[PDB]
């Protein structure tokens, strides 16, 4: 097991929607993958359990991880400060890509997005660090609650999360 596997159990206004699993590419982006793993297990005492996808644009992506402000201006890594973009080796090739949402170069915190399309124009601006393994149809369901500007029609939360195995 070099590359860890994590899961989100997604709920819509409180009702269980489904499970999304991701492979984290620790073998290419260890530091970014570890940030995301530990934020998913809750092992540092904070992280994703209970947070929401604040920004969903159908046909583009679903953004989350702002567990401090819930709006896109928050978030926090496990390194005690925003962290460097580790590399841009992996590309944004299609639906299912897991990449870091950032506010400019080397501003990694805890925010992330799941691509629901090919978004090649993001390559070299966001660190791709994983990909959906199970539940892309749960991601496609999450898209139905988004809009052009990202506002959601219902509250899309990560009801639980953790690492598998």
């Amino acid at each position: 097991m070099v590359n860890p596997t994590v899961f989100f159990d997604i709920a819509v206004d409180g009702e269980p929607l489904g499970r999304v699993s991701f492979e984290l590419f620790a073998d290419k982006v260890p530091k970014t993958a570890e940030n995301f793993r530990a934020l998913s297990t809750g092992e540092k005492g904070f992280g994703y359990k209970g947070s929401c996808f604040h920004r969903i644009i159908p046909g583009f992506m679903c953004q989350g991880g702002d567990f401090t402000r819930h709006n896109g201006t928050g978030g926090k890594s496990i390194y005690g400060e925003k962290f460097e973009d580790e590399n841009f080796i992996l590309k944004h090739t299609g639906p299912g890509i897991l990449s870091m949402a950032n506010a400019g170069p080397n501003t990694n915190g805890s925010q992330f997005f799941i691509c629901t399309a090919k978004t090649e124009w993001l390559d070299g601006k966001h660190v791709v660090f994983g990909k959906v393994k199970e539940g892309m149809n749960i991601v496609e369901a999450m898209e139905r609650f988004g809009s052009r500007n990202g506002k959601t029609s219902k509250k899309i939360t990560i009801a639980d999360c953790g690492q598998l195995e």
């Binding site: 644009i57 997005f113 978004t119 993001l122 990202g150």
Partner: protein, 136 residues
């Protein structure tokens, strides 16, 4: 429509700067001449002024201070930019350093607008006031 500032308006500006030693009149004159200007046009107006380096530096410093101050009151939202929508303007983008003409019009045409041209123009006017204060 992108209609650059006219050469007529530039030489009038130059003429004003030339003819005054940065007297109070250069201010209403600047606002009368920069009506609806994009940041790009504003800088063109400003860079045609040559040979008044100390005053220009005072003006540069004021813009730079104001761009930083804009950044600090406008925290960026994280995430990737989706096709068609625009990025959130920075201080340097307001001053046209980090931004294209297309993007500038983009922001100014938007509804609701972010009037980058008028914002930058307020900062220039603040620089110009410091200049007329020093030189009278």
């Amino acid at each position: 429509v992108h209609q650059a500032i006219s050469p007529r308006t530039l030489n009038a500006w130059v003429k004003v700067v030339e003819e005054k030693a940065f007297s109070p009149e250069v201010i209403p004159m600047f606002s009368a001449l920069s009506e609806g200007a994009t940041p790009q046009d504003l800088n063109t107006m400003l860079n045609t002024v040559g040979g008044h380096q100390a005053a220009m530096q005072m003006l540069k410093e004021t813009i730079n201070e104001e761009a930083a101050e804009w950044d600090r009151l406008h925290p960026v939202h994280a995430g990737p930019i989706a096709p068609g929508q625009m990025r959130e303007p920075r201080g340097s983008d307001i001053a046209g350093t980090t931004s294209t003409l297309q993007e500038q019009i983009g922001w100014m045409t938007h509804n609701p607008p972010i009037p980058v041209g008028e914002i930058y123009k307020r900062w220039i006017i603040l620089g110009l006031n410091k200049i007329v204060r020093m030189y009278s």
